[PDB]
Amino acid sequence: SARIGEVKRETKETNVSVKINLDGHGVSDSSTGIPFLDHMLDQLASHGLFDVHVRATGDTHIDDHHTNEDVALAIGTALLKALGERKGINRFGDFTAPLDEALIHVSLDLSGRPYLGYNLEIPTQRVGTYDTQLVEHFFQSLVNTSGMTLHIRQLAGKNSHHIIEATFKAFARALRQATESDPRR
Amino acid sequence: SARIGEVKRETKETNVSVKINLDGHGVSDSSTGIPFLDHMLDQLASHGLFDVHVRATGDTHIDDHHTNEDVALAIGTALLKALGERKGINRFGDFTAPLDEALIHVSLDLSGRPYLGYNLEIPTQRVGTYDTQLVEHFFQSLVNTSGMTLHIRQLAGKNSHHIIEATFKAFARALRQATESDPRR
Amino acid sequence: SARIGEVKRETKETNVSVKINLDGHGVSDSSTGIPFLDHMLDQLASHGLFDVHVRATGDTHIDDHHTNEDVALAIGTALLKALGERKGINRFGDFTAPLDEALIHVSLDLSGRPYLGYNLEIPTQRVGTYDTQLVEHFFQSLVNTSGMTLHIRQLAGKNSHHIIEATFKAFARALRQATESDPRR
Amino acid sequence: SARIGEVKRETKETNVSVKINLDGHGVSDSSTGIPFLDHMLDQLASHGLFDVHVRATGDTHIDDHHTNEDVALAIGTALLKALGERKGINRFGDFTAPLDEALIHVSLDLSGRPYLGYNLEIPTQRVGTYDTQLVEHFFQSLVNTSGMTLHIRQLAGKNSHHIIEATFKAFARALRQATESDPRR
Amino acid sequence: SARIGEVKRETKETNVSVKINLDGHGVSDSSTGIPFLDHMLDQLASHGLFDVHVRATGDTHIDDHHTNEDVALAIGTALLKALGERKGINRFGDFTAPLDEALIHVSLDLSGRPYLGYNLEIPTQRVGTYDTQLVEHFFQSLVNTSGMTLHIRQLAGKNSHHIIEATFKAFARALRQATESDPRR
Amino acid sequence: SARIGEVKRETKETNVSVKINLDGHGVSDSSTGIPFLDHMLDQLASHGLFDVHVRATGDTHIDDHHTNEDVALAIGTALLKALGERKGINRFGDFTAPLDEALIHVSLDLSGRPYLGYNLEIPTQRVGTYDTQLVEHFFQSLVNTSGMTLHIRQLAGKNSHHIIEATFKAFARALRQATESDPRR
Ligand SMILES: [Mn+2]
Ligand SMILES: [Mn+2]
Ligand SMILES: [Mn+2]
Ligand SMILES: [Mn+2]
Ligand SMILES: [Mn+2]
Ligand SMILES: [Mn+2]
Ligand SMILES: [Mn+2]
Ligand SMILES: [Mn+2]
Ligand SMILES: [Mn+2]
Ligand SMILES: [Mn+2]
Ligand SMILES: [Mn+2]
Ligand SMILES: [Mn+2]
Ligand SMILES: [Mn+2]
Ligand code: NA
Ligand code: NA
Ligand code: NA
Ligand code: NA
Ligand code: NA
Ligand code: NA
Secondary structure, eight states: OOOEEEEEEEOSSEEEEEEEETTOOOOEEEEOSOHHHHHHHHHHHHHHTOEEEEEEEEOTTTOSHHHHHHHHHHHHHHHHHHHTTOTTBOOEEEEEEEETTEEEEEEEEOOSSOEEEEOOOOOSSEETTEETTHHHHHHHHHHHHHTOEEEEEEEEOOOHHHHHHHHHHHHHHHHHHHHSBOTTO | OOOEEEEEEEOSSEEEEEEEETTOOOOEEEEOSOHHHHHHHHHHHHHHTOEEEEEEEEOTTTOSHHHHHHHHHHHHHHHHHHHTTOTTBOOEEEEEEEETTEEEEEEEEOOSSOEEEEOOOOOSSEETTEETTHHHHHHHHHHHHHTOEEEEEEEEOOOHHHHHHHHHHHHHHHHHHHHSBOTTO | OOOEEEEEEEOSSEEEEEEEETTOOOOEEEEOSOHHHHHHHHHHHHHHTOEEEEEEEEOTTTOSHHHHHHHHHHHHHHHHHHHTTOTTBOOEEEEEEEETTEEEEEEEEOOSSOEEEEOOOOSSSEETTEETTHHHHHHHHHHHHHTOEEEEEEEEOOOHHHHHHHHHHHHHHHHHHHHSBOTTO | OOOEEEEEEEOSSEEEEEEEETTOOOOEEEEOSOHHHHHHHHHHHHHHTOEEEEEEEEOTTTOSHHHHHHHHHHHHHHHHHHHTTOTTBOOEEEEEEEETTEEEEEEEEOOSSOEEEEOOOOOSSEETTEETHHHHHHHHHHHHHHTOEEEEEEEEOOOHHHHHHHHHHHHHHHHHHHHSBOTTO | OOOEEEEEEEOSSEEEEEEEETTOOOOEEEEOSOHHHHHHHHHHHHHHOOEEEEEEEEOTTTOSHHHHHHHHHHHHHHHHHHHTTOTTBOOEEEEEEEETTEEEEEEEEOOSSOEEEEOOOOOOSEETTEETHHHHHHHHHHHHHHTOEEEEEEEEOOOHHHHHHHHHHHHHHHHHHHHSBOTTO | OOOEEEEEEEOSSEEEEEEEETTOOOOEEEEOSOHHHHHHHHHHHHHHTOEEEEEEEEOTTTOSHHHHHHHHHHHHHHHHHHHTTOTTBOOEEEEEEEETTEEEEEEEEOOSSOEEEEOOOOOSSEETTEETHHHHHHHHHHHHHHTOEEEEEEEEOOOHHHHHHHHHHHHHHHHHHHHSBOTTO
C-alpha cells in the first residue's frame, strides 16, 4: 500500500495543503503562488519519483517569505506522516548531482533529529522574482518538521538557477534512496 | 485615561495620518502604500501592545523613500504628543529579541534628545519590493521627531526579513517598557 | 492551576522520567547518573523556580552522551506539554547572569521553531567527569523537542564550572520570564 | 520597614559618613569635596530610587584619590548592612542605559563574593577636575566591601562625561532591580 | 530676453523634446518615462531656478538606458543653445550641497571643452526602478553635448537616493552661478 | 525688519538667556561662565554679522558640560524662532575658512532635519580650561534644536585654538549666507 502523507495548515499569513506519495511516479502538481518554488517542487517529484500535490495562498505582496516557510513546514510534516513507523527502509540517502557547471552533494538520514548543514553560495540575490535567501529557509523549515538530518554541500557552481536546481535534484535522489525499501530489512 | 497622540503630516510628496495609543491592546491598522512597512507596523502594535493607526499615500511611483520618511516623522511626533509630560513612566527601555537565527538588542531613553545608534548589516538590497536602506531612515526620522535616544545593535542574523522583523519586535518591547508606569514614580 | 508536563521515554540506551511544574517553588529532585548534570538541573529549579523531577538509567559505562541527550530531549518535551496553548504568557525571555568572572547572556522565544545559537568556549575538556562538549548537546536537544528559539552568548569567563553554571542561571531566569503571565495579555 | 545602612569611617586620610535607604524615593544628599563624584552620587539616588546621604572631608590638596576610595569603601559597607539577610530579593540585576551616544551594560549579583569586571575606555584624563582613573577605583572599592559581583561593559560612547554618567545610570537601575523584592520568594 | 534653448531630437530608440530657460523661476515640467529621472529634473528646476520642460518617449521595456542618454544629450544641447555667445556671465560655478548625511561638491566651467570627473559610489543598484549606473551616464552625455567641464566629488553619503539628489542640488546651484551675470563683465 | 529670536530656559543645572538678530551688525554680548565659549560666540557675531546676546549661569564646578550643552540648545531654538517661515532665503550656506595652518570647510542647509557630520581632530584635551570634547557637543546640540543639516570637515590644522576658531569663522560665514535673502526668491 502506497505511503501517503497529507497536511492542511492554516496560519495568520498563509493557507497550505500538501499531499505526498512516497511510492509515486513523479506526478507534479504544485501551485504555491511562487513560480520558482513550483519549478523546484516539480524537480522534487520528477527526480524523486514522489507524487507531489501542493496548494498555497498567502501574503506575497509583503514578500515570498511567509508562503515559502509555511509550504516547507507542511511538506516536512507530510513526509513525517507518510513515513509512519519507518520499518524496513534504507533510512540513509547520499547523492551528488550535476547541472552543467554546478555540482551539489546531499546526504541525509531519516533520524528523527532535525539538523541542517548548508553551505550553498548563491551569487545573485534574485532568480526571476525569487529571493535566493529563501532556499536555505525552505530546507531548514522542512528539516525542522520532518525531523531529518540533512547536509547540503556545494562542490561547484556559478549560475544561481543551476546551483539551486542541482540541489533539488540531489535532494530528491537522496530522499528517494532513504525512503526506499532495504531488501535485507 | 489612555495616552493617545494624533498627527496629520502633509508634504508636497506624501499625505499622512497617524494615531497611536500608548495604552492599547495591539490593534493594528496601518496602510502606507508600502506592504513591508505595513507588516513592520503590525509588529510594532502586536509586540508593543500599542494601537497603531496609519494612513498614507504618496509618490511611490518614484520610490518608497519619501513615504517611508514622512510616515516615520509623523509616528515620532505622535509618540511625543501621546507621552505628554512623561510623568511617572519607566522612561528607559531595554530588550533583546530573537527571530530564529537573528538576535537584536534595542536600548532606548525617552530623553528629549534625539540620537540614533544603528549597526544593522542587512545582507540583501530588497525584501519584497522594500529597499533595505529605508530601515535605518525609518528609525532616524522617528528619533528626530520623538526626541528619543535609541540604540539598535545586531548580535546575530543572516536572513534580511528576520533581522528587520526582530528589530521591530525588540524596539516595540523596549518602547512598551519605557512608556509603562514605574510603580515607584 | 499549575502547568505540569510529564514525559516517560525509554530507548535502547536509556530509561528516562521527567516531570516539570512551570509554576513551582524551586523543588529540585534530579538524579541522572551524571553528577554534574544533576547540579545544573538543581540550578535550573532554584533559579527558574521550576519544580524539576528527573530520573535516568543509562549506559554511562560507554560515556555520558546517550544519557545527557535523552534527558535533554525529555525535558524539552515536558516543557512543550506544560506550556499547553501558551495563552497569556510573556513568551520572550532575556537575562544576563554573572558568576564571578563569568557572564552569560541568554535570550529565548517560545516560538514553536527550534533554533540554537551557542557560542560558549569552555576551556577545559572535563568538569569532574562531565565532558564539556555535552553542554551544547544538552541545549540543542532541549531546543529540538521544545521548539524554542534559544541564543546563548558568552560575554566573559575563564573557569569552566563558572561558565557552565552561569549559563544555567541565565537560562533558568530567561525561561522563568518567558513562561510567566504577561499582565496585559 | 525600610532597609537602611549607616557607616562612619575615619582613616588617617579622610572622614566619611554614609547613610543609604534601599527603599527610598531618590533623595540626593552627597557632599564629598569632589563635585563630579557628588554629581554621580545624585545619579545613583535618582536612577536607583535610593536615598543617599554622604559626607566626606579629606586630603584633596594631594589629589582626589584617598577621598574617592574612602567614600566608595563606606558605600559598599553601607549597602551590605542595609541588605541584612537578603531574604526574598531579586539578588541579580541587569540593565543597559544610554546617554546620547554612550551605551553601558551593567550586570550584577549580590553574591557575597567580590568581583569587578570593568572595560570602560574613557578618552580624556579629566572630567572637570575629576581624574577619570578614579571611576574604576570607585567601583572596585565598592565591590570589595559590599561583596558584589559586578560587570560593567562599554557598548558605545565617545564623550567622557556621557560614558561615566551612563555607567552610573545603568548601575543604579541594575542595583535597584537586585535589591527589590522577588514576588515569588 | 530670457535665454531659452530648445531641442527636438528623435533617434530609432527615443523621441525627445527639451526646452530650458536659464533665466527662469523654477518651473518644472519633465516627463521622461523614468520617474526617478523626472524627480531629479524637478530638483534641477527648483534648485537652479531654471524653467525645465522635458518630454521623452523611449524604449523603456529594454531598460532605461537609451531614454536616459537621449534626454541628457538633448539637455546638454539645449544648454549650449541657450548660452549663445556667453557674454558677461560668471562662467564658473562651485557649490557643495548636503542632504542629511550626504555631501556632494560640484565644480564646473562653461568652457567649450567636455570633461566629466565623477567619483560617486552609490551603494545600491536600484533606486525605485532606476539603475544607479545611469547617474554617471546622464552627466557624461550632458557634458559631451554642452561642452562643459564638470567635476562631481562625493564627500559623504550612505543613502543612494540622498547621494544622487544631493548631486542634483549641488549641480543645479553650481550651474545657476555659472550662467548668472558677472556684475563686472 | 529684523529677524529676532529670544529663548529663556532654566534647568536644575543651568539658567540661560539667548537673543539673536539674524540681520545684525556683529554686536557681541556673550557671558556664559565659560571664557573660551564666550570667545567663540564673539567670533560667531563678528564673522556672521549676527547680534548675539547670551547669559548663562550653572554648575561649572562639576564641569563645563551642562552649561555648554544648555547654551547650544538655546541658541539652536533661538535661530529656529528668528528664521520664522524661512521665506526667500538662500537656505544653503558653504564656506571654507583658514586660520593660519588650520582650514575648515562648513556646509549647511536650513532644512528642518537635524544632522551633524563632524570630523575635527583636536590634538589637545584642553584649550585654556575648555574641554575640547565640548566643541562637538556644542554643534550637535545646536543642530538638534535648530533642525539644521550641518557638515564640519577639517582639511588642515595643528593648533587646537586655531582649529576650533577656524570652525566658528567658517560656520558663522556659512550661516550668514544661508540666512541672507536670495535675490531671485
Ligand atoms: Mn522565517
Ligand atoms: Mn530550470
Ligand atoms: Mn530622506
Ligand atoms: Mn514576517
Ligand atoms: Mn552512540
Ligand atoms: Mn548525540
Ligand atoms: Mn557549582
Ligand atoms: Mn587606592
Ligand atoms: Mn551630567
Ligand atoms: Mn543599447
Ligand atoms: Mn550609452
Ligand atoms: Mn527625493
Ligand atoms: Mn550631554
Ligand atoms: Na525492506
Ligand atoms: Na508610575
Ligand atoms: Na497574562
Ligand atoms: Na519577595
Ligand atoms: Na554681466
Ligand atoms: Na529673497
